[PDB]
Design a protein around this nucleic acid. Structure first.
Ligand SMILES: [Mg+2]
Ligand SMILES: [Mg+2]
Ligand SMILES: [Mg+2]
Ligand SMILES: [Mg+2]
Ligand SMILES: [Mg+2]
Ligand SMILES: [Mg+2]
Ligand SMILES: [Mg+2]
Ligand SMILES: [Mg+2]
Ligand SMILES: [Mg+2]
Ligand SMILES: [Mg+2]
Ligand SMILES: [Mg+2]
Ligand SMILES: [Mg+2]
Ligand SMILES: [Mg+2]
Ligand SMILES: [Mg+2]
Ligand SMILES: [Mg+2]
Ligand SMILES: [Mg+2]
Ligand SMILES: [Mg+2]
Ligand SMILES: [Mg+2]
Ligand SMILES: [Mg+2]
Ligand SMILES: [Mg+2]
Ligand SMILES: [Mg+2]
Ligand SMILES: [Mg+2]
Ligand SMILES: [Mg+2]
Ligand SMILES: [Mg+2]
Ligand SMILES: [Mg+2]
Ligand SMILES: [Mg+2]
Ligand SMILES: [Mg+2]
Ligand SMILES: [Mg+2]
Ligand SMILES: [Mg+2]
Ligand SMILES: [Mg+2]
Ligand SMILES: [Mg+2]
Ligand SMILES: [Mg+2]
Ligand SMILES: [Mg+2]
Ligand SMILES: [Mg+2]
Ligand SMILES: [Mg+2]
Ligand SMILES: [Mg+2]
Ligand SMILES: [Mg+2]
Ligand SMILES: [Mg+2]
Ligand SMILES: [Mg+2]
Ligand SMILES: [Mg+2]
Ligand SMILES: [Mg+2]
Ligand SMILES: [Mg+2]
Ligand SMILES: [Mg+2]
Ligand SMILES: [Mg+2]
Ligand SMILES: [Mg+2]
Ligand SMILES: [Mg+2]
Ligand SMILES: [Mg+2]
Ligand SMILES: [Mg+2]
Ligand SMILES: [Mg+2]
Ligand SMILES: [Mg+2]
Ligand SMILES: [Mg+2]
Ligand SMILES: [Mg+2]
Ligand SMILES: [Mg+2]
Ligand SMILES: [Mg+2]
Ligand SMILES: [Mg+2]
Ligand SMILES: [Mg+2]
Ligand SMILES: [Mg+2]
Ligand SMILES: [Mg+2]
Ligand SMILES: [Mg+2]
Ligand SMILES: [Mg+2]
Ligand SMILES: [Mg+2]
Ligand SMILES: [Mg+2]
Ligand SMILES: [Mg+2]
Ligand SMILES: [Mg+2]
Ligand SMILES: [Mg+2]
Ligand SMILES: [Mg+2]
Ligand SMILES: [Mg+2]
Ligand SMILES: [Mg+2]
Ligand SMILES: [Mg+2]
Ligand SMILES: [Mg+2]
Ligand SMILES: [Mg+2]
Ligand SMILES: [Mg+2]
Ligand SMILES: [Mg+2]
Ligand SMILES: [Mg+2]
Ligand SMILES: [Mg+2]
Ligand SMILES: [Mg+2]
Ligand SMILES: [Mg+2]
Ligand SMILES: [Mg+2]
Ligand SMILES: [Mg+2]
Ligand SMILES: [Mg+2]
Ligand SMILES: [Mg+2]
Ligand SMILES: [Mg+2]
Ligand SMILES: [Mg+2]
Ligand SMILES: [Mg+2]
Ligand SMILES: [Mg+2]
Ligand SMILES: [Mg+2]
Ligand SMILES: [Mg+2]
Ligand SMILES: [Mg+2]
Ligand SMILES: [Mg+2]
Ligand SMILES: [Mg+2]
Ligand SMILES: [Mg+2]
Ligand SMILES: [Mg+2]
Ligand SMILES: [Mg+2]
Ligand SMILES: [Mg+2]
Ligand SMILES: [Mg+2]
Ligand SMILES: [Mg+2]
Ligand SMILES: [Mg+2]
Ligand SMILES: [Mg+2]
Ligand SMILES: [Mg+2]
Ligand SMILES: [Mg+2]
Ligand SMILES: [Mg+2]
Ligand SMILES: [Mg+2]
Ligand SMILES: [Mg+2]
Ligand SMILES: [Mg+2]
Ligand SMILES: [Mg+2]
Ligand SMILES: [Mg+2]
Ligand SMILES: [Mg+2]
Ligand SMILES: [Mg+2]
Ligand SMILES: [Mg+2]
Ligand SMILES: [Mg+2]
Ligand SMILES: [Mg+2]
Ligand SMILES: [Mg+2]
Ligand SMILES: [Mg+2]
Ligand SMILES: [Mg+2]
Ligand SMILES: [Mg+2]
Ligand SMILES: [Mg+2]
Ligand SMILES: [Mg+2]
Ligand SMILES: [Mg+2]
Ligand SMILES: [Mg+2]
Ligand SMILES: [Mg+2]
Ligand SMILES: [Mg+2]
Ligand SMILES: [Mg+2]
Ligand SMILES: [Mg+2]
Ligand SMILES: [Mg+2]
Ligand SMILES: [Mg+2]
Ligand SMILES: [Mg+2]
Ligand SMILES: [Mg+2]
Ligand SMILES: [Mg+2]
Ligand SMILES: [Mg+2]
Ligand SMILES: [Mg+2]
Ligand SMILES: [Mg+2]
Ligand SMILES: [Mg+2]
Ligand SMILES: [Mg+2]
Ligand SMILES: [Mg+2]
Ligand SMILES: [Mg+2]
Ligand SMILES: [Mg+2]
Ligand SMILES: [Mg+2]
Ligand SMILES: [Mg+2]
Ligand SMILES: [Mg+2]
Ligand SMILES: [Mg+2]
Ligand SMILES: [Mg+2]
Ligand SMILES: [Mg+2]
Ligand SMILES: [Mg+2]
Ligand SMILES: [Mg+2]
Ligand SMILES: [Mg+2]
Ligand SMILES: [Mg+2]
Ligand SMILES: [Mg+2]
Ligand SMILES: [Mg+2]
Ligand SMILES: [Mg+2]
Ligand SMILES: [Mg+2]
Ligand SMILES: [Mg+2]
Ligand SMILES: [Mg+2]
Ligand SMILES: [Mg+2]
Ligand SMILES: [Mg+2]
Ligand SMILES: [Mg+2]
Ligand SMILES: [Mg+2]
Ligand SMILES: [Mg+2]
Ligand SMILES: [Mg+2]
Ligand SMILES: [Mg+2]
Ligand SMILES: [Mg+2]
Ligand SMILES: [Mg+2]
Ligand SMILES: [Mg+2]
Ligand SMILES: [Mg+2]
Ligand SMILES: [Mg+2]
Ligand SMILES: [Mg+2]
Ligand SMILES: [Mg+2]
Ligand SMILES: [Mg+2]
Ligand SMILES: [Mg+2]
Ligand SMILES: [Mg+2]
Ligand SMILES: [Mg+2]
Ligand SMILES: [Mg+2]
Ligand SMILES: [Mg+2]
Ligand SMILES: [Mg+2]
Ligand SMILES: [Mg+2]
Ligand SMILES: [Mg+2]
Ligand SMILES: [Mg+2]
Ligand SMILES: [Mg+2]
Ligand SMILES: [Mg+2]
Ligand SMILES: [Mg+2]
Ligand SMILES: [Mg+2]
Ligand SMILES: [Mg+2]
Ligand SMILES: [Mg+2]
Ligand SMILES: [Mg+2]
Ligand SMILES: [Mg+2]
Ligand SMILES: [Mg+2]
Ligand SMILES: [Mg+2]
Ligand SMILES: [Mg+2]
Ligand SMILES: [Mg+2]
Ligand SMILES: [Mg+2]
Ligand SMILES: [Mg+2]
Ligand SMILES: [Mg+2]
Ligand SMILES: [Mg+2]
Ligand SMILES: [Mg+2]
Ligand SMILES: [Mg+2]
Ligand SMILES: [Mg+2]
Ligand SMILES: [Mg+2]
Ligand SMILES: [Mg+2]
Ligand SMILES: [Mg+2]
Ligand SMILES: [Mg+2]
Ligand SMILES: [Mg+2]
Ligand SMILES: [Mg+2]
Ligand SMILES: [Mg+2]
Ligand SMILES: [Mg+2]
Ligand SMILES: [Mg+2]
Ligand SMILES: [Mg+2]
Ligand SMILES: [Mg+2]
Ligand SMILES: [Mg+2]
Ligand SMILES: [Mg+2]
Ligand SMILES: [Mg+2]
Ligand SMILES: [Mg+2]
Ligand SMILES: [Mg+2]
Ligand SMILES: [Mg+2]
Ligand SMILES: [Mg+2]
Ligand SMILES: [Mg+2]
Ligand SMILES: [Mg+2]
Ligand SMILES: [Mg+2]
Ligand SMILES: [Mg+2]
Ligand SMILES: [Mg+2]
Ligand SMILES: [Mg+2]
Ligand SMILES: [Mg+2]
Ligand SMILES: [Mg+2]
Ligand SMILES: [Mg+2]
Ligand SMILES: [Mg+2]
Ligand SMILES: [Mg+2]
Ligand SMILES: [Mg+2]
Ligand SMILES: [Mg+2]
Ligand SMILES: [Mg+2]
Ligand SMILES: [Mg+2]
Ligand SMILES: [Mg+2]
Ligand SMILES: [Mg+2]
Ligand SMILES: [Mg+2]
Ligand SMILES: [Mg+2]
Ligand SMILES: [Mg+2]
Ligand SMILES: [Mg+2]
Ligand SMILES: [Mg+2]
Ligand SMILES: [Mg+2]
Ligand SMILES: [Mg+2]
Ligand SMILES: [Mg+2]
Ligand SMILES: [Mg+2]
Ligand SMILES: [Mg+2]
Ligand SMILES: [Mg+2]
Ligand SMILES: [Mg+2]
Ligand SMILES: [Mg+2]
Ligand SMILES: [Mg+2]
Ligand SMILES: [Mg+2]
Ligand SMILES: [Mg+2]
Ligand SMILES: [Mg+2]
Ligand SMILES: [Mg+2]
Ligand SMILES: [Mg+2]
Ligand SMILES: [Mg+2]
Ligand SMILES: [Mg+2]
Lengths: 97, 146
RNA sequence: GCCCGGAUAGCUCAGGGUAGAGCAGGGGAUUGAAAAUCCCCGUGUCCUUGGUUCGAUUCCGAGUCCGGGCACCA
RNA sequence: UGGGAGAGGGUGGUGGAAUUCCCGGAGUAGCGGUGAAAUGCGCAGAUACCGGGAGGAACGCCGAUGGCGAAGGCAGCCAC
RNA sequence: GGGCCUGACUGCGAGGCCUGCAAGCCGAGCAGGGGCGAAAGCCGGGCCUAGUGAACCGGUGGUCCCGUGUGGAAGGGCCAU
RNA sequence: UGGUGUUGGCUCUUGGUCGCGCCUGCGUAGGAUAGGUGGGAGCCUGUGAACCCCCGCCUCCGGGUGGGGGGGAGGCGCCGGUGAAAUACCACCCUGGCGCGGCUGGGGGCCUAACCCUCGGAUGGGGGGACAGCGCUUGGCGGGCAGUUUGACUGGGGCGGU
RNA sequence: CGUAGGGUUAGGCGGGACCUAAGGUGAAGCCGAAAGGCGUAGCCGAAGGGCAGCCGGUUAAUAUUCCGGCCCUUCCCGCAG
RNA sequence: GUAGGGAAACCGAGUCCGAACAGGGCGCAGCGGCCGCAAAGUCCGCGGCCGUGGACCCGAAACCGGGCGAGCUAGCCCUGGCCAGGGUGAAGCUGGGGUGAGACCCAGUGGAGGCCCGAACCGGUGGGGGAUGCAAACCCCUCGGAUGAGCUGGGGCUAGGAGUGAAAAGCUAACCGAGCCCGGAGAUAGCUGGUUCUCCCCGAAAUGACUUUAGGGUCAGCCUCAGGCG
RNA sequence: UGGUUCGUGGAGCCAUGGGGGAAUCUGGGCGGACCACCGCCUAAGGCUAAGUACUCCGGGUGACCGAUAGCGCACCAGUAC
RNA sequence: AGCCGGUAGCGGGCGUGGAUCCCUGGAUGUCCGAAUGGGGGAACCCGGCCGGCGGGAACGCCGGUCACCGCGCGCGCGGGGGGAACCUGGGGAACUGAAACAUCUCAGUACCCAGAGGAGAGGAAAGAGAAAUCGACUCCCUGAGUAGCGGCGAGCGA
């Protein structure tokens, strides 16, 4: 899953750290690391279809920023977008960011 | 999620009302079917702007209703007819009572907003109801005479 | 180390006001026998200790003993 | 030539009873089985009862000391 | 064998044995508060030589020593195990 | 594989806590079905009393009871008999049990509109359907793959022994 | 082999200004931290399809290429039907 | 450097343990006649040795990264080509017989097949030769397949923990139980080898203890030099 | 989960993939869990010389080499092979 | 005052009317290459449009123009590729060290990729951190192998 078109959120590199043992705070001798290895954390990217100037537009967006799509639809009403392609409509919507 | 209903909706609320729904319902049912709009800030004061405008245009229509309530319960319309002692030969219509008022006291008034079911065919003093909009009726005293 | 349990007759187990039940053991009926069956009979500090109650198997507290279950080990 | 009785044979169709299993409901402490029992099955809800479903095999009463076939053998009902 | 008892002490320790280190061992005497004995005195477990495990990490009871602007707290330290 | 996001609508049936209402509580002796302690010589009934019939009922099956049509001057306490504990009314509560309300949590049925698949027709139709898929997080299985470890003495090493 | 000079001649032979095969590439579109990976059409891609030349002579050295004879293809423009 | 003791608060020529004015641990004080010399200490230079670095030099088998390879070979894809000659003689079909009709039998025709013999082509069985070869796999004789799961030309696709494999861990450009190149990189090697002028004085050890230690180490023993003691 | 000296630690701070999700100075972040008090600073927009690094290039200078040395190459070398 | 490159020679020319030569600007600049009309096995092949050349319509040659993508209202402007090291950002090993090894180390190094430029980054406090103090960021010295971190090991290190 790539990349949020609204926020620019993007996959990140994280470690997966396996630990054994009992935490000092519970009276144990402490935690040991039994493995560290790389992994990725992905944006919760999802699809959002909206009809704008009679045209169907589709965003690939982190669930966090789903509401920011509809906000752009509102602010879009000031522009005249009819006659343009769905490609050119989206370009206009994203300049309003 | 708060939305402004653009229609009365079963067990949701009345038009112009601001109610609270699960996001999926609004953005997947209500909003794509023109049923409501997101209660954002921008189009929130719009609700205000239009509730204020209706409050105006109504209570105006309740004041151009009263500028003709005082100015019509404060006179009589005397209609000289031809008649023998009780009953008229012709009659007086709302249209009649209309052209007559627009003549003497020169007050334009609409015959169909005037409760004259049967045209007047006798002499005497008559009280008649006039509604230039509801809850603002107007009693008209009129004298048909020979 | 921590939590849940149990403990009641020879044996396995049921339960604020009873001490039960089955199976082992005994006699009786019955039979070629061995059983099944049928009558009766026993066999309790209900782990111990201190308190609740008018009273304790029961409630609470505390120990001993045996089960489980979770976790940790420089 | 005209007639008859018949589980004679072959093909296709199709009808109800019963058993089993599956689902739904209702219900609880046993069911099954034997000379007596035990294995088995059952609170993870069996047996017994009611509705639905699936499928195979055999055709109760009629039926008999009966009928048919050369014998082996042939039995729900229908058509050829 | 018996009576009374808890020295199977606390705070220290001259001087030695043994020895690569680190350990292991024996130890008079002084102070506190005791036990036994009339007293001299003895007593810091057991006739003796086996019955054991450095450090790190962590538990517990004390101590009130540090406490990240300050007062507390978290968490350490120290003594004991 | 649980939780949660994307993720919505309508129902049905549940469970858990919290608030209020109403009851349930029968060893023994005794008026009978006595929860605990406390208050307390009066509560009541025209703001409907003793018998009748519908019941939710709970019944240890003797009784308890609520609202109903009955119903038109009457009830039961202090009294006391044996009680460990008096009985009427009031009250805080205990073991339960619904009735409602609060937040909740679970299952079931449906729906369509997110998402998925499909349709020479595509702002649409059909199908699946809030499941699947995909994000974050939980625990598990996991030589399919990876990094490694697999002691020393020894009349050679292993084996045995230590 | 060393030095120097000379030698390879096409509308018809082979390939190109034609076709498409595996494959490759790739408007649309899809996907991936970046690099990139896919992808219908289309395009590319031959020893496959398609397409007009035979015989003889000539040079030291080329020849279906030059020459000789007899044949043929496409493109342009014109005339007739 | 001029103060140390204590875990620390802190005190201070002392401090820590301790109830202690106890004991103990770790600490505290130049040479000659105010001038001179010397000295703590410190700064620079020089030499020995140690730590960190590749650290005396040369040498692995390997591990990791990024690229280069299927013009060899293995499989598949697309498109073409090749297999002398001879032999055997399936089904079917025709006629004849047969029978109630049939099965079936006979002859003729026919030309099937991971059929037979054998060149090309593909192989590589046995022996001999070759063995600083003609040749980093060849030569002679012999032998297997040779219409098929056949052989072969051209165009393509799949590769390094990956491909491909009628399976041998085979093959993936003449050494594959993990290809090749460059890079990390001077990897690491407690091992083996090697270590370069002269003279002079002294001169070992091959034991002990501990050691994933035993042909390697740390301490001690034993050698050497400086200063001091006597 | 990363960054920092900080390897789960008493673990703050800075960053952020997932969930939940404010306020506009009487708002908000920080001073190493947390709380109080006392201070410091104003997040979620952007730009900004110089002082710093390097050496394909030019010049200057060596107790730098002097043809097995010095660059792989003093020479027709990233060549022949 | 000589000159026609290294390069002499054959055979021919030039220069005080200022050559050769050196410096700056300009003109010309086949084909390939980001390569960009299209294609392609780089340096070859095949085109459209406008204008020209030939006898020229077929055929050929000459000149001009024709890729994609981004941004602004078909028109413009911009991008693409390269550069020894250096720089920032996105990814990111292993040998080795720990006398075995996994956490740890090597190291955010090697390396891949994107981007930038003569530099790049950073930068005008939601800072520091105890001074009742300071006052953007960068770079050097020191603070300091300190504070700390650490199978409290090897080491790491403000
Ligand atoms: Mg995990
Ligand atoms: Mg603690
Ligand atoms: Mg850990
Ligand atoms: Mg750890
Ligand atoms: Mg992984
Ligand atoms: Mg998506
Ligand atoms: Mg959506
Ligand atoms: Mg839509
Ligand atoms: Mg989020
Ligand atoms: Mg959210
Ligand atoms: Mg009239
Ligand atoms: Mg306990
Ligand atoms: Mg007949
Ligand atoms: Mg059932
Ligand atoms: Mg059983
Ligand atoms: Mg059972
Ligand atoms: Mg049950
Ligand atoms: Mg069946
Ligand atoms: Mg007969
Ligand atoms: Mg004694
Ligand atoms: Mg005494
Ligand atoms: Mg001593
Ligand atoms: Mg010693
Ligand atoms: Mg000892
Ligand atoms: Mg004493
Ligand atoms: Mg004494
Ligand atoms: Mg005495
Ligand atoms: Mg004495
Ligand atoms: Mg003593
Ligand atoms: Mg003894
Ligand atoms: Mg350790
Ligand atoms: Mg410790
Ligand atoms: Mg403590
Ligand atoms: Mg303090
Ligand atoms: Mg503080
Ligand atoms: Mg305080
Ligand atoms: Mg204090
Ligand atoms: Mg402590
Ligand atoms: Mg502690
Ligand atoms: Mg403490
Ligand atoms: Mg999961
Ligand atoms: Mg969910
Ligand atoms: Mg549904
Ligand atoms: Mg459905
Ligand atoms: Mg739909
Ligand atoms: Mg529909
Ligand atoms: Mg539907
Ligand atoms: Mg659709
Ligand atoms: Mg649809
Ligand atoms: Mg649909
Ligand atoms: Mg789901
Ligand atoms: Mg969760
Ligand atoms: Mg997991
Ligand atoms: Mg395993
Ligand atoms: Mg393995
Ligand atoms: Mg697996
Ligand atoms: Mg493997
Ligand atoms: Mg080991
Ligand atoms: Mg050995
Ligand atoms: Mg040996
Ligand atoms: Mg041996
Ligand atoms: Mg020996
Ligand atoms: Mg020997
Ligand atoms: Mg030997
Ligand atoms: Mg052994
Ligand atoms: Mg020659
Ligand atoms: Mg020639
Ligand atoms: Mg010709
Ligand atoms: Mg042409
Ligand atoms: Mg072509
Ligand atoms: Mg083509
Ligand atoms: Mg591409
Ligand atoms: Mg595209
Ligand atoms: Mg591609
Ligand atoms: Mg394709
Ligand atoms: Mg073409
Ligand atoms: Mg091609
Ligand atoms: Mg082509
Ligand atoms: Mg061709
Ligand atoms: Mg063909
Ligand atoms: Mg051809
Ligand atoms: Mg041709
Ligand atoms: Mg011809
Ligand atoms: Mg000639
Ligand atoms: Mg020739
Ligand atoms: Mg010829
Ligand atoms: Mg000719
Ligand atoms: Mg014509
Ligand atoms: Mg100190
Ligand atoms: Mg003290
Ligand atoms: Mg002292
Ligand atoms: Mg002292
Ligand atoms: Mg000095
Ligand atoms: Mg040294
Ligand atoms: Mg080094
Ligand atoms: Mg050295
Ligand atoms: Mg390795
Ligand atoms: Mg390995
Ligand atoms: Mg690679
Ligand atoms: Mg390659
Ligand atoms: Mg091949
Ligand atoms: Mg090949
Ligand atoms: Mg072929
Ligand atoms: Mg053949
Ligand atoms: Mg043949
Ligand atoms: Mg043949
Ligand atoms: Mg023959
Ligand atoms: Mg043949
Ligand atoms: Mg013959
Ligand atoms: Mg024949
Ligand atoms: Mg023949
Ligand atoms: Mg035939
Ligand atoms: Mg025949
Ligand atoms: Mg034949
Ligand atoms: Mg044949
Ligand atoms: Mg054959
Ligand atoms: Mg033969
Ligand atoms: Mg053969
Ligand atoms: Mg054969
Ligand atoms: Mg043969
Ligand atoms: Mg061959
Ligand atoms: Mg061969
Ligand atoms: Mg051979
Ligand atoms: Mg032979
Ligand atoms: Mg041989
Ligand atoms: Mg050989
Ligand atoms: Mg040969
Ligand atoms: Mg031969
Ligand atoms: Mg031969
Ligand atoms: Mg042969
Ligand atoms: Mg042969
Ligand atoms: Mg053959
Ligand atoms: Mg043949
Ligand atoms: Mg074939
Ligand atoms: Mg082939
Ligand atoms: Mg082929
Ligand atoms: Mg080949
Ligand atoms: Mg090829
Ligand atoms: Mg490949
Ligand atoms: Mg393949
Ligand atoms: Mg490999
Ligand atoms: Mg590799
Ligand atoms: Mg493989
Ligand atoms: Mg093969
Ligand atoms: Mg090679
Ligand atoms: Mg090779
Ligand atoms: Mg090979
Ligand atoms: Mg091999
Ligand atoms: Mg390997
Ligand atoms: Mg490997
Ligand atoms: Mg290898
Ligand atoms: Mg190879
Ligand atoms: Mg090579
Ligand atoms: Mg490289
Ligand atoms: Mg490198
Ligand atoms: Mg290295
Ligand atoms: Mg090295
Ligand atoms: Mg080396
Ligand atoms: Mg090694
Ligand atoms: Mg070694
Ligand atoms: Mg050597
Ligand atoms: Mg040597
Ligand atoms: Mg000497
Ligand atoms: Mg000597
Ligand atoms: Mg020795
Ligand atoms: Mg030795
Ligand atoms: Mg050891
Ligand atoms: Mg060893
Ligand atoms: Mg050895
Ligand atoms: Mg060994
Ligand atoms: Mg040796
Ligand atoms: Mg060794
Ligand atoms: Mg030594
Ligand atoms: Mg000596
Ligand atoms: Mg010495
Ligand atoms: Mg001396
Ligand atoms: Mg002497
Ligand atoms: Mg970290
Ligand atoms: Mg951290
Ligand atoms: Mg860090
Ligand atoms: Mg820093
Ligand atoms: Mg931290
Ligand atoms: Mg804070
Ligand atoms: Mg914070
Ligand atoms: Mg924060
Ligand atoms: Mg975040
Ligand atoms: Mg405000
Ligand atoms: Mg403020
Ligand atoms: Mg605030
Ligand atoms: Mg903050
Ligand atoms: Mg701060
Ligand atoms: Mg603080
Ligand atoms: Mg601040
Ligand atoms: Mg602000
Ligand atoms: Mg900022
Ligand atoms: Mg800047
Ligand atoms: Mg700067
Ligand atoms: Mg230079
Ligand atoms: Mg120079
Ligand atoms: Mg030379
Ligand atoms: Mg050289
Ligand atoms: Mg020389
Ligand atoms: Mg030299
Ligand atoms: Mg150079
Ligand atoms: Mg050079
Ligand atoms: Mg050289
Ligand atoms: Mg050279
Ligand atoms: Mg050369
Ligand atoms: Mg001349
Ligand atoms: Mg001349
Ligand atoms: Mg001359
Ligand atoms: Mg002049
Ligand atoms: Mg001049
Ligand atoms: Mg120029
Ligand atoms: Mg081009
Ligand atoms: Mg191209
Ligand atoms: Mg033209
Ligand atoms: Mg001409
Ligand atoms: Mg022309
Ligand atoms: Mg042309
Ligand atoms: Mg052109
Ligand atoms: Mg590029
Ligand atoms: Mg550039
Ligand atoms: Mg860098
Ligand atoms: Mg970076
Ligand atoms: Mg990796
Ligand atoms: Mg690592
Ligand atoms: Mg490593
Ligand atoms: Mg390793
Ligand atoms: Mg190292
Ligand atoms: Mg190591
Ligand atoms: Mg090592
Ligand atoms: Mg190893
Ligand atoms: Mg390692
Ligand atoms: Mg690590
Ligand atoms: Mg390194
Ligand atoms: Mg690191
Ligand atoms: Mg980097
Ligand atoms: Mg580098
Ligand atoms: Mg500069
Ligand atoms: Mg700058
Ligand atoms: Mg500012
Ligand atoms: Mg600011
Ligand atoms: Mg300021
Ligand atoms: Mg600052
Ligand atoms: Mg200030
Ligand atoms: Mg300092
Ligand atoms: Mg560190
Ligand atoms: Mg480290
Ligand atoms: Mg670190
Ligand atoms: Mg580091």
């Amino acid at each position: 899953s790539k990349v949020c078109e609204i926020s620019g959120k993007r996959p990140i590199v994280a470690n997966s750290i396996q630990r054994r043992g009992k935490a000092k705070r519970e009276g144990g001798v402490g935690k040991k690391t039994t493995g560290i290895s790389k992994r990725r954390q992905y944006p919760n990217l999802q699809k959002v279809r909206v009809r704008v100037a009679g045209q169907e537009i589709t965003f690939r967006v982190a669930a966090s920023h789903i509401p920011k799509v509809y906000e752009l639809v509102e602010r879009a009403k000031g522009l005249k977008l009819e006659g343009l392609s769905p490609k050119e409509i989206k370009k206009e919507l994203l300049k309003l960011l | 999620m708060k939305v402004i209903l653009l229609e009365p909706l079963e067990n949701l609320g009345d038009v112009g009302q601001v109610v609270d729904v699960k996001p999926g319902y609004a953005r997947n049912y209500l909003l794509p079917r023109g049923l409501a709009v997101l209660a954002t800030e921008s189009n929130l004061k719009a609700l205000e702007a239009r509730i204020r405008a209706q409050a105006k245009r109504l209570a105006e229509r309740k004041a151009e209703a009263e500028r003709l309530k005082e100015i019509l319960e404060n006179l009589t319309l005397t209609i000289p007819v031809r008649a023998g002692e009780t009953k008229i030969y012709g009659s007086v219509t709302a249209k009649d009572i209309a052209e007559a008022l627009s003549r003497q006291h020169g007050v334009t008034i609409d015959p169909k907003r005037l409760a004259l079911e049967k045209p007047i065919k006798e002499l005497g003093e008559y009280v008649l109801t006039y509604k230039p909009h509801p809850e603002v009726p107007i009693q008209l005293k009129v004298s048909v005479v020979a």
